[PDB]
Fold:
Amino acid sequence: RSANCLKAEAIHYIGDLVQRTEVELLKTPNLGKKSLTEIKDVLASRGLSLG
DNA sequence: AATCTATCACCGCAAGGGATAAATATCTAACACCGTGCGTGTTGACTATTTTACCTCTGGCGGTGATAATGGTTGCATGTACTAAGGAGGTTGT
Structure:
């Protein structure tokens, strides 16, 4: 349910997730652990990035 | 604001449905030709485009009739409920 509680912030789509750098990332509901931990490098394997 | 165990379940990851795009084959449409006929051109005779002239329409409006005719029309303002004002005039009072 990481999928439910993320898209509940109306960040439903990958296009703006590109803004969510490790300085202000948390604004979302719940989304508390394995999701939040390391997915940020496989994000860069379909091909996106942060900075 | 970090930790996770233990929810209700999404992912874990097998299957299979539709799709679309390739190739084929059909359709139509765009064109280039041709032929028709119309609105390509000047000229010419017509007759009635316009003007002015003349002879003689339509409608401008001014003018007023006489056997005599010589006491008139007009219908419903409103019917209630109030009550404030002015009007009357005799008089018993100021």
